[PDB]
């Protein structure tokens, strides 16, 4: 069993462990990073994003394809981020405001992008339109001042739990629960996927996952300088 370190991103502290809203599973901080936009050739910071994974399950699920790889190989491999997104384990995303945003701004930006992509790939069903209504519904009249958070729990059955906090505190319970795999994945893939808005969170995630898998490989590994066995 292992631990990871805490991360601080432009003043936002993401603890090494958390429990997502609506879940009993402990999660570890897999990666965190700034989300910004280049306007001018100035990098303007909008949010700090922490990506947490199910402590029980994620390493074991990822090791099979990713053990052996250096951080810079995971960081440049679209299939690694896609395995994180689509993994058979729970994920938890925490988006914490650096600049203020409103509920309508955030939800409009994400759902319009989702919808555009789904139409482009020919996979836009009534189920997705109804999931987008439900998502927009949860966000209308929320507003997010600096330090407030948006909280997403991503289930492996493809249920997205949305919740909000006024600060970095993560609440016990969930808010809306949207049973739609495409939107549940899209929300996280919008962050760490090929088109991901946080290259920083991606590089962090690659680096720390690579480290975790390497320490794990070396635990149960026979060395002559440590011969003192505990089996018969
Ligand atoms: O809505 C946002 C920004 C709008 C904006 C408005 C005026 C500007 O000058 C620049 C950006 C926004 C920013 C980051 C994000 O992750 C999700 C979002 O929805």
Numbering used by the authors: 0 to 231
Paper text:
In plants, flavonoid biosynthesis begins with phenylpropanoid metabolism in which phenylalanine is transformed into p-coumaroyl-coenzyme (Co)A. Chalcone synthase (EC 2.3.1.74), the first enzyme responsible for generating the basic flavonoid skeleton, then catalyzes the condensation of three molecules of malonyl-CoA with one molecule of p-coumaroyl-CoA to form chalcone. This is followed by the intramolecular and stereospecific cyclization of chalcone into (2S)-flavanone—a precursor of many downstream flavonoids—by chalcone-flavanone isomerase (CHI; EC 5.5.1.6). Type I CHIs—which are found in most plants including barley, rape, petunia, Arabidopsis, and rice—isomerize naringenin chalcone (2',4',6',4-tetrahydroxychalcone) into 5-hydroxy-flavonoid; whereas type II CHIs, common in leguminous plants, utilize both naringenin chalcone and isoliquiritigenin (2',4',4-trihydroxychalcone) to synthesize 5-deoxy-flavonoid. The family of genes encoding CHI in Deschampsia antartica—one of the only two vascular plant to naturally colonize the Maritime Antarctic—was recently characterized at the molecular level. The crystal structures of the unliganded and isoliquiritigenin-bound forms of DaCHI1 revealed that DaCHI1 can bind to type II substrates suggesting that DaCHI1 can produce antioxidant flavonoids from various substrates for protection against abiotic oxidative stresses.
The structures of unliganded DaCHI1 and the isoliquiritigenin-complexed catalytically inactive S189A mutant were determined at 2.7 and 2.1 Å resolution, respectively. An electron density map of isoliquiritigenin was observed near the entrance to the substrate-binding cleft. Isoliquiritigenin was bound via hydrophobic interactions with Met36, Ile38, Phe45, and Leu100. The 4'-hydroxyl group of isoliquiritigenin also formed hydrogen bonds with Thr46 and Tyr105 mediated by two water molecules each. However, ligand binding caused an open/close movement around the strands of the β3–β4 region. However, isoliquiritigenin, which is a chalcone, exhibited a distinct mode of interaction, binding to the putative entrance of the hydrophobic binding pocket of DaCHI1. As such, we cannot rule out the possibility that crystal packing inhibits the deep binding of isoliquiritigenin in the DaCHI1 active site.
